[PDB]
Amino acid sequence: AVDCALDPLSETKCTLKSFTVEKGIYQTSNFRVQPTESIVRFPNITNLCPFDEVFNATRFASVYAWNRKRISNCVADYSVLYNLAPFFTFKCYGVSPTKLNDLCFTNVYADSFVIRGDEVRQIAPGQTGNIADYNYKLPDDFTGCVIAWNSNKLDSKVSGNYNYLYRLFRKSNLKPFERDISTEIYQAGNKPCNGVAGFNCYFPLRSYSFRPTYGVGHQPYRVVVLSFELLHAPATVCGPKKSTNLVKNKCVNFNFNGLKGTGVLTESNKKFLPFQQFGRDIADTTDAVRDPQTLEILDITPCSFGGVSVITPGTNTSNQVAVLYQGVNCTEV
């Protein structure tokens, strides 16, 4: 047996896959410097932002007039979005619905409405049907989450509810995130309908008429869609992570506002100007960052690394080796 981490001769044997090494110079591996500490930097915003009244609301809007709300400059918490109901559907595209407590987003959009029971599958990327092309359309590069839950005990009534409407007739399919509130009559025929009902003149709205008696696949469902935008920005909104003091001139691993890395942070001389947040290099990688608690610029440089070679005669003659470190001045090994 041979231990591949005892001495350079053993490493050479382990690389060559042999118990005898002949005369020559062999390239064994590379040497790096490991991190010692760990820091996390997040913005100092501590207030919360509206999530209770988005879900604990009295009346949601119809499908064709879906309610839109913008969420920014807060601290998001998603633990409270667990006990909505005994059973509910929670599907996230582009993110996993367990890791969105340590991610920083630019702007959050919340769209709320109420849908027929069996049409929940139609709120999805690139799906066709009745509401996905005439009421609510989603893009093909969506990055967000969809939540749906039962609303029989609250919405359906015995006396009769007719306050929820959808649209059935339209010229062309809707652009994503586009709303229509027109009531102009349909023109299937060749003659004008002069704003009166008749054949080929249909009013492009319809009612649900929910009653507590229909089958399990027909009761109303409440649907809310969350849209994110994970890009480069001041990062107005993100969740509950505790900050830590920053260190300099030491190889550590860092998490700057959602950007994870390892390296050495140094005071910067770049000529940033107000709107510039971070910088790049020739190879399209991050080089400079701006600390979101002091508004100062730091430069990132990976800590020392290099290549190691072993010079030995044949194992038949001796077991002595010499080590060559490539491209380094060994006053700074």
């Binding site: 920005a233 000529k271 940033f272 100007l273 709107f275 910088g279 790049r280």
Partner: protein, 234 residues
Amino acid sequence: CVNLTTRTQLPPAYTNSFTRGVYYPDKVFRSSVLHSTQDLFLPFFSNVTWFHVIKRFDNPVLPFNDGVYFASIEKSNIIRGWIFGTTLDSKTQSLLIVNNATNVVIKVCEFQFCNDPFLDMESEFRVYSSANNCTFEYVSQPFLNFKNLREFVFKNIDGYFKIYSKHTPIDLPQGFSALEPLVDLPIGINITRFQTLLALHRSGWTAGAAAYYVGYLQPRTFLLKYNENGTITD
């Protein structure tokens, strides 16, 4: 407001733009690098519409196809603000930007104007007759032959209204001048037409002459050069 029939029909002048309308398209720092971008820019060597104001009144209504490059050569600050909208009445939201004495105010809501809106040393500020509840308001520090050249770029995309600006002391001249981003606004409106605003004061009396140029933006691919600092030089 009053109605007059003394206007003289005359088409606005047409001039050309050589190398103007270059702005930083991203929020990232690059030094001494040639980069390629694909965005809504102003085509090089393109004709633009020139209006001259001194009497003669020229505040037409112009479309808002994709974006606006608005340039003003001026002295003594006659051009004041901007109106943006779709129908310009109380039936749709309208955006309004006015430069105060020492501030700038931006607001988006319904308004009411005359057929030829105008502004009346400033003591009276009467541009709109009515104003209902407004969604977004904003107040900020003031944006500030002919001796002042002001260049502005107005864009509206991704549910954001973007204002880029640049000022210079000096028939547009040659040279290169990049435009730094100034304001982003989360408005989300329809926007189809716009109209400028100038300041007139009753007063022998001499009226400062001003000229302003309007150009339209199109999607194009550009190759930009960043020098040792974060300055676009070509």
